[PDB]
Amino acid sequence: SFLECLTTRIESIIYTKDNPSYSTILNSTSLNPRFFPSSARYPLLIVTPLHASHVQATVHCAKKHGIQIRIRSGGHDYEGLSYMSNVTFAIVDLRNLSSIDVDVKRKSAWVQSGATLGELHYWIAKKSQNLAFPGVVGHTVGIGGMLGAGGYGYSSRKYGLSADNILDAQLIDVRGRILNRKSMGEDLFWAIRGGGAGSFGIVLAWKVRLVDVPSKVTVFTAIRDWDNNATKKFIHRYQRRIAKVDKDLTIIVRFLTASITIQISTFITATYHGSQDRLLSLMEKEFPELGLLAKECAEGAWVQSILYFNLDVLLNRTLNRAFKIKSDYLKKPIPDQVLENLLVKLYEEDIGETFVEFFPYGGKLDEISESEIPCPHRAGNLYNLRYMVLWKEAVNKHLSWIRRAYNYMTPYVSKNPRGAFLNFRDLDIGTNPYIKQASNWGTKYFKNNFYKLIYVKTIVDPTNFFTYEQSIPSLLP
Amino acid sequence: HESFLECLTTRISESIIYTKDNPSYSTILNSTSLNPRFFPSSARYPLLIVTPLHASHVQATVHCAKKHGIQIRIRSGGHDYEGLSYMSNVTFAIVDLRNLSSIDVDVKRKSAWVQSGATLGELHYWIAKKSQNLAFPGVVGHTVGIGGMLGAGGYGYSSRKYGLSADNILDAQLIDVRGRILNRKSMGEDLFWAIRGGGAGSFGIVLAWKVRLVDVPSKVTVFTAIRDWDNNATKKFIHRYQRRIAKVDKDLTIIVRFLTASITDEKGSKKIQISTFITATYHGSQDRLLSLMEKEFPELGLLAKECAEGAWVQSILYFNLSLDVLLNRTLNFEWRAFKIKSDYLKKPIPDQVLENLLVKLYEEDIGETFVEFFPYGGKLDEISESEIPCPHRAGNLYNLRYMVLWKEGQNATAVNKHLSWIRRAYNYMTPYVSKNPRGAFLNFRDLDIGTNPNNYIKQASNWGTKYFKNNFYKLIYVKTIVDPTNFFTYEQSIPSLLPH
Numbered sequence A: 001s002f003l004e005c006l007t008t009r010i011e012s013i014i015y016t017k018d019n020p021s022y023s024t025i026l027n028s029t030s031l032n033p034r035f036f037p038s039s040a041r042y043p044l045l046i047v048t049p050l051h052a053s054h055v056q057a058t059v060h061c062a063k064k065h066g067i068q069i070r071i072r073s074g075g076h077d078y079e080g081l082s083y084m085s086n087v088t089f090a091i092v093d094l095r096n097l098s099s100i101d102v103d104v105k106r107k108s109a110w111v112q113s114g115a116t117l118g119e120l121h122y123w124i125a126k127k128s129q130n131l132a133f134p135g136v137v138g139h140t141v142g143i144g145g146m147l148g149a150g151g152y153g154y155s156s157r158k159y160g161l162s163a164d165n166i167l168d169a170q171l172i173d174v175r176g177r178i179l180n181r182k183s184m185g186e187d188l189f190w191a192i193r194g195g196g197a198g199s200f201g202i203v204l205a206w207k208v209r210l211v212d213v214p215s216k217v218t219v220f221t222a223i224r225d226w227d228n229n230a231t232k233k234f235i236h237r238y239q240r241r242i243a244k245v246d247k248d249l250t251i252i253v254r255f256l257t258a259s260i261t262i263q264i265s266t267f268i269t270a271t272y273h274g275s276q277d278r279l280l281s282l283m284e285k286e287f288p289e290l291g292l293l294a295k296e297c298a299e300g301a302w303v304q305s306i307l308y309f310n311l312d313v314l315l316n317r318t319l320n321r322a323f324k325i326k327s328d329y330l331k332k333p334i335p336d337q338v339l340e341n342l343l344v345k346l347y348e349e350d351i352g353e354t355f356v357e358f359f360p361y362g363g364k365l366d367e368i369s370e371s372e373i374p375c376p377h378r379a380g381n382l383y384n385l386r387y388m389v390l391w392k393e394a395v396n397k398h399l400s401w402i403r404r405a406y407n408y409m410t411p412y413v414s415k416n417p418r419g420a421f422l423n424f425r426d427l428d429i430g431t432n433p434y435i436k437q438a439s440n441w442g443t444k445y446f447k448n449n450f451y452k453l454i455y456v457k458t459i460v461d462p463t464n465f466f467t468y469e470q471s472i473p474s475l476l477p
Numbered sequence B: 001h002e003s004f005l006e007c008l009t010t011r012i013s014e015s016i017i018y019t020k021d022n023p024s025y026s027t028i029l030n031s032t033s034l035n036p037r038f039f040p041s042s043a044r045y046p047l048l049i050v051t052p053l054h055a056s057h058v059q060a061t062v063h064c065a066k067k068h069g070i071q072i073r074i075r076s077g078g079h080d081y082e083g084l085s086y087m088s089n090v091t092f093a094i095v096d097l098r099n100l101s102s103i104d105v106d107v108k109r110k111s112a113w114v115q116s117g118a119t120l121g122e123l124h125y126w127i128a129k130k131s132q133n134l135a136f137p138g139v140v141g142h143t144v145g146i147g148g149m150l151g152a153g154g155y156g157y158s159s160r161k162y163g164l165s166a167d168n169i170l171d172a173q174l175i176d177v178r179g180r181i182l183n184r185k186s187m188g189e190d191l192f193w194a195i196r197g198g199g200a201g202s203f204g205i206v207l208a209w210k211v212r213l214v215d216v217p218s219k220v221t222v223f224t225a226i227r228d229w230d231n232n233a234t235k236k237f238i239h240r241y242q243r244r245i246a247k248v249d250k251d252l253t254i255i256v257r258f259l260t261a262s263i264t265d266e267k268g269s270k271k272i273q274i275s276t277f278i279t280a281t282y283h284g285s286q287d288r289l290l291s292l293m294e295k296e297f298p299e300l301g302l303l304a305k306e307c308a309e310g311a312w313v314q315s316i317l318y319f320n321l322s323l324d325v326l327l328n329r330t331l332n333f334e335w336r337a338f339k340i341k342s343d344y345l346k347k348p349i350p351d352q353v354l355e356n357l358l359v360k361l362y363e364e365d366i367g368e369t370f371v372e373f374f375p376y377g378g379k380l381d382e383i384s385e386s387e388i389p390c391p392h393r394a395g396n397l398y399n400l401r402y403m404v405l406w407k408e409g410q411n412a413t414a415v416n417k418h419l420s421w422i423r424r425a426y427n428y429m430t431p432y433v434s435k436n437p438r439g440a441f442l443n444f445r446d447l448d449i450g451t452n453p454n455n456y457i458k459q460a461s462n463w464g465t466k467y468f469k470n471n472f473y474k475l476i477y478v479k480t481i482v483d484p485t486n487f488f489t490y491e492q493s494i495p496s497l498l499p500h
């Protein structure tokens, strides 16, 4: 019944299950093969709007006919919420809403939200080698959900999250009225930058800040074997020191198991905004134990750092293992024996199919108030630990391993609330069935911003049309 | 009004009800009416004043005022900058907690139970009678009641070492709108969080606080350095202070005061210049303070003869006053009407801008006008904005305070002039301070920031976000749980989500 409403309002943009190009659309950005066997990943329909009129028509029809909407930019949702539901749903995919307009003179760019971050980086790089928008590591990440949840990458300690560099946005309201930052008010504008944007509206474009980047950016990857080297108690120094090391430098740690003769390997990877000479000087000054040899570094343009962590046009292809992620915030460093007890669990799974990662939260992330955007994890956070398990299509063993490791780490991590990064979506922390129960997941994502979030939600979508597993609830039923 | 007094006398059956008949009504009302700007006002007169001695009196008062439409203004010390604890635009009665001042100090468990009508001086005295190595960091004014002080945040010379006074609260006792006496466990952690640093008067009546005790070294060093801002480029030390005081050693708190003081020209005449009182407390010996100052601030030229080392309590005496039983007297420096404003600095004030702000001190009488810097470094970085309702934690360089004072002589052209001075200084500083929201410290109450009507939440957010950046929203939630009918209401009280 619903599809008649759409076509009557405003073609060949409606992809029903019968339509011969249906499945290829659906799989293309359902990017978590853990959810492939699910029986909730088949929507009634998929709209790929080209203009805001299509978005308004879709919202109008889906509200008036009991259909749920699954907003999609890139499909990188760790829990795959953007392409599945337990209710009759339809995907509004912003694939073909992706225009990018770069303003070198004003240091800003209007990027339509269905564009990937690799595209934004590429189109900034062909205009300047000294402007950039700092983002996540994965270059296939859609801009829409990325800026909706906020964004952490190798450059966040210098410039903050991606949501800390947003100037304006354009959005489709539950009423279907097109509104930018100026006409929407700054409570809702506050919401969309780092709150659950799918629970506030469908965001079609963002005017985003561009930031200076030196013409020399240096990356490095240092592989060191955790098994026995007492020399790598730099990790011990790293935990208690990396959040206050010079903010141009972000070192990310990855823990996995790899065969050498099965032992535990440590991948120390980093970006530094400056020349290799100065990077070597700084890190030898602070962490002379890592032994970062100059042959382990790479200077270049910023875009080459982007390439390193992913013919100088390689960022425009979105063609590239099932997995689950958990995240945790450390406000005091993990005691050593506890850390080794956590790491030995890596052998409980197949070689290199499980990761434990440290993401540092220093520099500019201290400077920014917990209320600046919905993301509250600013000051006192040493880093964001990521638990990771991988496999292909019993699955319960992988999930049991991840949940066990998390629960072992329980007494040593953030407590009230137990922090959780929104980009690392994790349905275990809580779901919606009212506000008391939903606060369980809300306060973990947003410490006290969750309450402002509910207030804005009740004003903005009182009927709770924009609802999903982790949508901000409304006070009015 | 009649039903109310019959209810009070009937409910819990002595001389704790002070009606207008009672010859000591005026003295009780005046005793903690501590802002002489409000002396000529016609709203500072309650129907009656209750001086509870037990929680039963407070419960009875809440019950009767609920059933007869009477408003309650909780008062502990009366230091409210806007005098809200002794004023209202409606028929109100004061619950004066003066005789709720019992103190139980526990050296071994490092905690103390303070009845809210005790002043901070009394609490300091009773800790000093037990150990010289325990302390409670508080506001500078020792006549400040514990109740309203802990209701708001509380800032002192040790907040950079220990956080706010509200950051060291372990337990509380409370009278809710239902008259139920409640501790931390029975009140819940949403309400327990609320009362610590939110508009605690807007949630209930807090009768006592169990507060954390903190260790202090056996030698604490104060200093006062007089420096001339007018011409001495050395005392452009300020430029460095702004950019360094938030990361200097947290055992150190240096507060600066800018005022106008008469000088003599050396040509015969009296000239008016800007004097700077650079004062500090350091938790440690005088030697370590002097060396620390040479490393961090060689510009003060801080000669040791400007310091005074001693026991911890001696700093309280130094910053209030000789025979050290003087903390049980709740009368202090000589009465002067005043108005205060505040702002939070996230980027250092540009030098010419600070100089132009300071020139405004010359517009008023000599030394009746102040601009002060309270630095926000140290442990105030460590504590999350959501830990208690106070949100001004990390990234704040300091808290600028504007202050203007005067005496009883009014022609109301002078009184209008002083307020215009304070507002002009504020509005000039606007583009250079915290913006959206414009921060404001709750202990420095300022009705100009915005008030409640006499949309609901839209308008209340105006002042709320400045006092409480985003915690204000959580605050309203707990209020709807705790006092949905908004019985505990005043000029800047958290509103309720339910309509009336």
Ligand SMILES: *Cc1cc2c(cc1C)nc1c(=O)[nH]c(=O)nc-1n2C[C@H](O)[C@H](O)[C@H](O)COP(=O)(O)OP(=O)(O)OC[C@H]1O[C@@H](n2cnc3c(N)ncnc32)[C@H](O)[C@@H]1O
Residues within 6 Å of the ligand: A031, A070, A071, A072, A073, A074, A075, A076, A077, A078, A080, A081, A082, A083, A094, A113, A114, A136, A137, A138, A140, A141, A142, A143, A144, A145, A146, A147, A148, A149, A150, A151, A152, A153, A196, A197, A198, A199, A201, A202, A203, A204, A423, A424
């Ligand atoms: C897959 C992946 C993800 C990732 C990463 C690396 C890879 C390979 N590295 C990250 C990193 O270093 N740091 C970080 O903080 N996150 C990282 N991620 C996660 C990624 O940032 C997030 O998944 C991202 O926020 C989602 O982007 P994407 O747009 O691709 O994902 P989605 O499923 O389509 O959407 C996510 C949620 O937002 C809602 N949504 C989507 N588009 C919109 C628009 N336009 N308006 C409103 N809401 C929108 C979806 O409904 C879903 O809930």
Ligand SMILES: *Cc1cc2c(cc1C)nc1c(=O)[nH]c(=O)nc-1n2C[C@H](O)[C@H](O)[C@H](O)COP(=O)(O)OP(=O)(O)OC[C@H]1O[C@@H](n2cnc3c(N)ncnc32)[C@H](O)[C@@H]1O
Residues within 6 Å of the ligand: B034, B073, B074, B075, B076, B077, B078, B079, B080, B081, B084, B085, B097, B116, B117, B138, B139, B140, B141, B143, B144, B145, B146, B147, B148, B149, B151, B152, B153, B154, B155, B156, B200, B201, B202, B204, B205, B206, B207, B443, B444, B445
């Ligand atoms: C007068 C003064 C104030 C002051 C100061 C020095 C002086 C001489 N120095 C301060 C400083 O260095 N740092 C700082 O942060 N504040 C400083 N102040 C301000 C002072 O702390 C506050 O004005 C404080 O509110 C005063 O406390 P007091 O106990 O005097 O409170 P009040 O005037 O009677 O009432 C004001 C508000 O508090 C509520 N209240 C009072 N008692 C209770 C109880 N028991 N329960 C709940 N609420 C209570 C009143 O209802 C009113 O809202």
Ligand SMILES: *[C@@H]1O[C@H](CO)[C@@H](O)[C@H](O)[C@H]1NC(C)=O
Residues within 6 Å of the ligand: B026, B027, B030, B039
């Ligand atoms: C109370 O304050 C008034 C100010 O209006 C003052 O004149 C009077 O002296 C005070 N009360 C007493 C008993 O002195």
Ligand SMILES: *[C@@H]1O[C@H](CO)[C@@H](O)[C@H](O)[C@H]1NC(C)=O
Residues within 6 Å of the ligand: B043, B087, B088, B089, B447, B454, B491
């Ligand atoms: C009473 O109302 C007036 C409004 O004219 C306001 O200025 C004042 O602050 C209110 N409160 C008191 C205690 O007078």
